[PDB]
Amino acid sequence: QNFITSKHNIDKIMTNIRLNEHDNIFEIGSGKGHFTLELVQRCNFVTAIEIDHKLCKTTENKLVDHDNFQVLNKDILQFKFPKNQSYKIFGNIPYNISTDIIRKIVFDSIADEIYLIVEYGFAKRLLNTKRSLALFLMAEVDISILSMVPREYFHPKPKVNSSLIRLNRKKSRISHKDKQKYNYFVMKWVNKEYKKIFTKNQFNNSLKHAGIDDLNNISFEQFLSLFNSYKLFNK
Amino acid sequence: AKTIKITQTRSAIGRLPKHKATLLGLGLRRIGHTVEREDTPAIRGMINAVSFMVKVEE
Amino acid sequence: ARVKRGVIARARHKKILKQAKGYYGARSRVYRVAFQAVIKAGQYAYRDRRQRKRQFRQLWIARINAAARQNGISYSKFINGLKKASVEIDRKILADIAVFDKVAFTALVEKAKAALA
Amino acid sequence: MKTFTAKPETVKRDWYVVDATGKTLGRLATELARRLRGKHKAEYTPHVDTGDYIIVLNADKVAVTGNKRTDKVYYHHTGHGGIKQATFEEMIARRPERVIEIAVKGMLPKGPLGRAMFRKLKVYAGNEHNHAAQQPQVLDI
RNA sequence: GAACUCGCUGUGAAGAUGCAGUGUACCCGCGGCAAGACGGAA
RNA sequence: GGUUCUCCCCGAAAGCUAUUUAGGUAGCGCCUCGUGAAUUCAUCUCCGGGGGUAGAUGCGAAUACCGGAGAAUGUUAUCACGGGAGACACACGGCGGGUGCUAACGUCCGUCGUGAAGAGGGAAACAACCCAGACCGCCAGCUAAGGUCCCAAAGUCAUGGUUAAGUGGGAAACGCGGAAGACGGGGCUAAACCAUGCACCGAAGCUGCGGCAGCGACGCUUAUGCGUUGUUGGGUAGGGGAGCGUUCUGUAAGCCUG
RNA sequence: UUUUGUAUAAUGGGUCAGCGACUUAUAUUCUGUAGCAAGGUUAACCGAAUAGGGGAGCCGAAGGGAAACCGAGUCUUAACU
Ligand SMILES: *CCN(CC[C@H](N)C(=O)O)C[C@H]1O[C@@H](n2cnc3c(N)ncnc32)[C@H](O)[C@@H]1O
């Protein structure tokens, strides 16, 4: 499903991934092995996670000539990622359990380099600064859009186009000495009770110090400037 | 020989069946129930079987 | 032999409804909630029959301590001295003579202090 | 036979004067709340108060041990909205006696009987009181 | 179903009028508004 | 989906092995009533051992078993037959063996405790966390877990130290050095932590007094009833026993009743 | 009420009075009780009809080997301890 080879509907997606020969790659969802067959070649060592055992036998049949990889028959949301060393995530995921992976890899994993493919609507909404989930999402990792993959490439035909997200760790500096006010700030911000976080004077002055002219279109560095203003106002 | 006073000081809730059988063979029913015994190595075996739950008096 | 059951059900309803006099509103007029009110009142009476013995003992202890603090001795040392003096007076009537008498409580406190020291 | 109870129309309550120069806040408020409840009398009953009226003067000289003079913070909500946040120093400089009252309101029971007991306490910020006609007594604590 | 039918903090068969803590609130009406809730699926 | 009066005793299971077996069927294991029987069975100690778990894995302990002998305790708690059922998607945690990277407050087999069928006390609230099994009544006393400054019953108790941070008032790698949302409030410089000793508060636990009910052993006796005497009595599905009330018929051309 | 388990985020009841749910017939097995006892008992029917007659039948006292046949024993067992 949405697996497919088409070979040349691939190398074309297999260019933007600027991977080197020394990277460790964890890949979420292999299908029949149209991507892992070159993921073993272009990197060092692959630890793939797949739960469908017949698809795992299909992958081993496609990969009889490779040794620097192993496959784990574990459930994705119950798997605990390694906490030492460094590796990169590659993902071609089903959509009907998409959120269940993303908070898995930004809040329960310490991966710094994220390559995923999602649908258009998810890629559009994830950068929207109104939802609380997205406000939790760019709290530690920067979000970027690379290119578009339309729907004629996936054999079971989907209905809408797809897109590639590339996500990078920025070192954040929002941590245990900084947190437990950030969830406060966003969870009081997206439902609009400004009186419980500011009075009138501090709200107006923070808006004039930030330079926000429209409250409905606010960017992220504006939001961290607002949080810094709240931090200086609240000791 | 010398007589021994035996007193139960705590209950038998959530214990192994071996301790319950030991209490049944000893003749103890409730907390604060004293009983009299004679000196036997088997009786001392019952005593060291449950030392945290009964109390001995020479 | 058809038997009508009009008298028996009416008597059974009137027996229960007589036990629920002095209840707010519909709990004292209809049957379907007066039964539950009677059951809950019985359960609460059955628990407060045990709670009363704790409440009165706590009241007696508070009165005993308040009366004994005036003579310059705490409750615990007073009770320990009374136990060391082998006096078998209970907490109720000792609090009663603490309230209704002053010279006898003073003599008791002096005896307990002499027995402790 | 039944135990004695305190009738509210026959019990006697007196008047006392408490100085508060240099005394600790909590160690005075605890004694004031104990004396206001009537726990120091042999006729003590929980459902009816038996405490004595207490006048507290020189309430602006109360001292707090430690660094609490700059970091003890009182919050207050209007019941809507915005909150009013103050520290110790501007609160004693603005309205002193409220602080002492707040401590008593932290210690007394809750309900109609709690405010009925709290009504018996009169706290003055100066050294002069106009209750000399009641003939109060000096109590040392 | 019976009601003498308040706001926050936390626990929750997981968004509490009834649970633990704390605060406010004299009794009863009259013309509105959409927020809760019933129609709604975030 | 529903099934209507009351009381007294005993009181479980969501497991195992086989099958033209896939929502199935047949036995076994768990419960109750009646009959009989062997010092029947359980706990502990000792004795030389069937295997190979110390000392010294080459011989082999406690603990997972089996055999014999022996004192004490236990309302036969043991087995066989007949009558009658209930259950046949259990949940959480512990011990001995596996899996998963001794990865991960990760996942399977024999065994146990708590709920299901258990009330009360403590951790603020809270089904598995700690103590502890509710016959009834008493304005009597002693204790376990937990506490003794006020809310709120009881030490502003005693001895010797530590902290100056409101750390205490939450924990993961070791940075006074990352430790920071979870003291309940008031508020505390001891009313925080460590060690010692003496008291007290603290339950439906134990004791003191009175009453009812069942099963045993004793003397008179006997429609088997008293008087000592130990002992027991929370309970869903289920088994056993003893009773209240309504209509009509015989006793009844009797009895009460302007 | 359904679930291991509920105030939870699964369902039902506006209130009162009356009505409404383990019955009947036939076989089969067991238990308590009553008469008779190596015997017990009648059906249809006759009958001044709950009386009396009617022994036509039904169950048991002797078993097992398919069987002929053998017997307080037999049968099977080469045959038994
Ligand atoms: C049940 C409908 N969903 C998605 C449908 C879609 N938003 C529409 O056009 O109606 C609503 C839920 O999904 C969230 N959501 C918003 N936008 C997206 C996108 N692009 N992709 C996936 N889910 C989306 C809504 O917030 C709501 O939870």
Short mmCIF file of N, CA, C and O (backbone and C1' of nucleotides) in Angstrom, two decimals, chain G residues 22-47:
data_model
loop_
_atom_site.label_atom_id
_atom_site.label_comp_id
_atom_site.label_asym_id
_atom_site.label_seq_id
_atom_site.Cartn_x
_atom_site.Cartn_y
_atom_site.Cartn_z
P C G 22 -44.31 -17.55 38.05
"O5'" C G 22 -43.81 -19.06 37.89
"C5'" C G 22 -44.66 -20.04 37.30
"C4'" C G 22 -43.93 -21.34 37.03
"C3'" C G 22 -43.56 -22.16 38.26
"O3'" C G 22 -43.68 -23.55 37.96
"C1'" C G 22 -41.61 -21.64 37.03
P U G 23 -44.52 -24.51 38.93
"O5'" U G 23 -45.93 -24.65 38.20
"C5'" U G 23 -47.00 -23.75 38.49
"C4'" U G 23 -48.07 -23.84 37.44
"C3'" U G 23 -48.40 -25.24 36.94
"O3'" U G 23 -49.31 -25.91 37.79
"C1'" U G 23 -48.14 -23.77 35.10
P U G 24 -49.23 -27.51 37.96
"O5'" U G 24 -49.94 -28.06 36.64
"C5'" U G 24 -51.30 -27.79 36.37
"C4'" U G 24 -51.68 -28.19 34.97
"C3'" U G 24 -51.40 -29.63 34.60
"O3'" U G 24 -52.39 -30.53 35.06
"C1'" U G 24 -50.66 -28.20 32.86
P A G 25 -51.97 -31.96 35.66
"O5'" A G 25 -51.75 -32.86 34.37
"C5'" A G 25 -52.83 -33.19 33.51
"C4'" A G 25 -52.36 -33.85 32.24
"C3'" A G 25 -51.39 -35.01 32.41
"O3'" A G 25 -52.04 -36.23 32.74
"C1'" A G 25 -50.61 -33.57 30.71
P U G 26 -51.29 -37.35 33.61
"O5'" U G 26 -50.30 -38.04 32.58
"C5'" U G 26 -50.79 -38.71 31.42
"C4'" U G 26 -49.68 -39.04 30.46
"C3'" U G 26 -48.54 -39.86 31.03
"O3'" U G 26 -48.85 -41.24 31.08
"C1'" U G 26 -47.67 -38.07 29.73
P A G 27 -48.02 -42.22 32.05
"O5'" A G 27 -46.81 -42.70 31.14
"C5'" A G 27 -45.71 -43.41 31.71
"C4'" A G 27 -44.44 -43.15 30.96
"C3'" A G 27 -43.16 -43.29 31.77
"O3'" A G 27 -42.74 -44.64 31.87
"C1'" A G 27 -43.09 -41.27 30.54
P U G 28 -42.40 -45.28 33.30
"O5'" U G 28 -40.91 -44.79 33.59
"C5'" U G 28 -39.88 -45.02 32.64
"C4'" U G 28 -38.74 -44.06 32.83
"C3'" U G 28 -38.19 -43.96 34.24
"O3'" U G 28 -37.31 -45.02 34.57
"C1'" U G 28 -38.48 -41.79 33.35
P U G 29 -37.39 -45.70 36.02
"O5'" U G 29 -36.42 -44.81 36.93
"C5'" U G 29 -35.02 -44.82 36.73
"C4'" U G 29 -34.34 -43.71 37.49
"C3'" U G 29 -34.58 -43.69 38.99
"O3'" U G 29 -33.74 -44.59 39.70
"C1'" U G 29 -34.86 -41.51 38.11
P C G 30 -34.20 -45.19 41.12
"O5'" C G 30 -34.04 -43.98 42.14
"C5'" C G 30 -32.75 -43.51 42.51
"C4'" C G 30 -32.82 -42.20 43.25
"C3'" C G 30 -33.54 -42.21 44.58
"O3'" C G 30 -32.74 -42.71 45.64
"C1'" C G 30 -34.25 -40.34 43.32
P U G 31 -33.41 -43.40 46.93
"O5'" U G 31 -34.00 -42.18 47.77
"C5'" U G 31 -33.14 -41.22 48.36
"C4'" U G 31 -33.91 -40.06 48.94
"C3'" U G 31 -34.95 -40.39 50.00
"O3'" U G 31 -34.38 -40.59 51.28
"C1'" U G 31 -35.88 -38.87 48.44
P G G 32 -35.05 -41.62 52.32
"O5'" G G 32 -36.34 -40.85 52.84
"C5'" G G 32 -36.24 -39.86 53.85
"C4'" G G 32 -37.57 -39.21 54.13
"C3'" G G 32 -38.67 -40.13 54.64
"O3'" G G 32 -38.58 -40.35 56.04
"C1'" G G 32 -39.53 -38.76 52.91
P U G 33 -39.03 -41.75 56.68
"O5'" U G 33 -40.61 -41.76 56.52
"C5'" U G 33 -41.43 -40.89 57.28
"C4'" U G 33 -42.86 -40.90 56.78
"C3'" U G 33 -43.57 -42.24 56.83
"O3'" U G 33 -44.09 -42.53 58.11
"C1'" U G 33 -43.93 -41.22 54.72
P A G 34 -44.23 -44.05 58.60
"O5'" A G 34 -45.57 -44.56 57.90
"C5'" A G 34 -46.83 -44.06 58.30
"C4'" A G 34 -47.95 -44.68 57.50
"C3'" A G 34 -47.92 -46.19 57.37
"O3'" A G 34 -48.45 -46.85 58.51
"C1'" A G 34 -48.30 -45.24 55.25
P G G 35 -47.99 -48.36 58.86
"O5'" G G 35 -48.88 -49.26 57.90
"C5'" G G 35 -50.29 -49.30 58.05
"C4'" G G 35 -50.95 -50.06 56.92
"C3'" G G 35 -50.47 -51.48 56.69
"O3'" G G 35 -51.03 -52.41 57.60
"C1'" G G 35 -50.64 -50.36 54.62
P C G 36 -50.17 -53.66 58.12
"O5'" C G 36 -49.97 -54.56 56.82
"C5'" C G 36 -51.04 -55.31 56.29
"C4'" C G 36 -50.68 -55.97 54.98
"C3'" C G 36 -49.57 -57.01 55.03
"O3'" C G 36 -50.02 -58.27 55.50
"C1'" C G 36 -49.20 -55.56 53.20
P A G 37 -49.05 -59.19 56.41
"O5'" A G 37 -47.81 -59.51 55.47
"C5'" A G 37 -47.91 -60.46 54.42
"C4'" A G 37 -46.72 -60.39 53.49
"C3'" A G 37 -45.40 -60.88 54.05
"O3'" A G 37 -45.27 -62.29 54.01
"C1'" A G 37 -45.07 -58.81 52.98
P A G 38 -44.06 -63.03 54.76
"O5'" A G 38 -43.01 -63.34 53.60
"C5'" A G 38 -43.11 -64.54 52.83
"C4'" A G 38 -43.64 -64.27 51.44
"C3'" A G 38 -43.67 -65.48 50.51
"O3'" A G 38 -44.79 -65.37 49.63
"C1'" A G 38 -42.31 -63.79 49.57
P G G 39 -46.22 -65.96 50.06
"O5'" G G 39 -46.95 -64.73 50.75
"C5'" G G 39 -47.77 -63.85 50.00
"C4'" G G 39 -47.09 -62.52 49.78
"C3'" G G 39 -47.96 -61.40 49.24
"O3'" G G 39 -48.74 -60.76 50.23
"C1'" G G 39 -45.96 -61.50 48.00
P G G 40 -50.17 -60.13 49.86
"O5'" G G 40 -49.81 -58.83 49.00
"C5'" G G 40 -49.18 -57.71 49.60
"C4'" G G 40 -48.83 -56.65 48.59
"C3'" G G 40 -49.98 -56.13 47.75
"O3'" G G 40 -50.75 -55.15 48.43
"C1'" G G 40 -48.13 -56.60 46.35
P U G 41 -52.36 -55.23 48.41
"O5'" U G 41 -52.75 -54.75 46.94
"C5'" U G 41 -52.36 -53.46 46.48
"C4'" U G 41 -52.36 -53.39 44.97
"C3'" U G 41 -53.71 -53.61 44.30
"O3'" U G 41 -54.54 -52.46 44.33
"C1'" U G 41 -52.06 -54.88 43.18
P U G 42 -55.99 -52.55 45.01
"O5'" U G 42 -56.82 -53.50 44.03
"C5'" U G 42 -57.68 -52.96 43.05
"C4'" U G 42 -56.95 -52.69 41.76
"C3'" U G 42 -57.82 -52.38 40.55
"O3'" U G 42 -58.26 -51.03 40.51
"C1'" U G 42 -56.19 -53.97 39.95
P A G 43 -59.60 -50.63 39.72
"O5'" A G 43 -59.19 -50.66 38.18
"C5'" A G 43 -58.26 -49.72 37.66
"C4'" A G 43 -58.15 -49.83 36.16
"C3'" A G 43 -59.46 -49.85 35.39
"O3'" A G 43 -59.98 -48.55 35.18
"C1'" A G 43 -58.04 -51.57 34.59
P A G 44 -61.56 -48.29 35.30
"O5'" A G 44 -62.17 -48.97 33.99
"C5'" A G 44 -61.92 -48.43 32.70
"C4'" A G 44 -62.39 -49.36 31.62
"C3'" A G 44 -63.85 -49.77 31.67
"O3'" A G 44 -64.71 -48.81 31.08
"C1'" A G 44 -62.51 -51.69 31.36
P C G 45 -66.08 -48.38 31.81
"O5'" C G 45 -66.80 -49.77 32.15
"C5'" C G 45 -67.48 -50.50 31.14
"C4'" C G 45 -67.84 -51.88 31.62
"C3'" C G 45 -68.93 -51.95 32.67
"O3'" C G 45 -70.23 -51.86 32.11
"C1'" C G 45 -67.13 -53.33 33.32
P C G 46 -71.42 -51.18 32.94
"O5'" C G 46 -71.81 -52.28 34.02
"C5'" C G 46 -72.38 -53.52 33.62
"C4'" C G 46 -72.54 -54.46 34.79
"C3'" C G 46 -73.35 -53.95 35.96
"O3'" C G 46 -74.75 -54.02 35.75
"C1'" C G 46 -71.38 -54.96 36.77
P G G 47 -75.72 -52.84 36.25
"O5'" G G 47 -75.34 -52.66 37.79
"C5'" G G 47 -75.87 -53.53 38.78
"C4'" G G 47 -75.19 -53.33 40.12
"C3'" G G 47 -75.49 -52.02 40.83
"O3'" G G 47 -76.72 -52.05 41.53
"C1'" G G 47 -73.16 -52.43 40.87
#
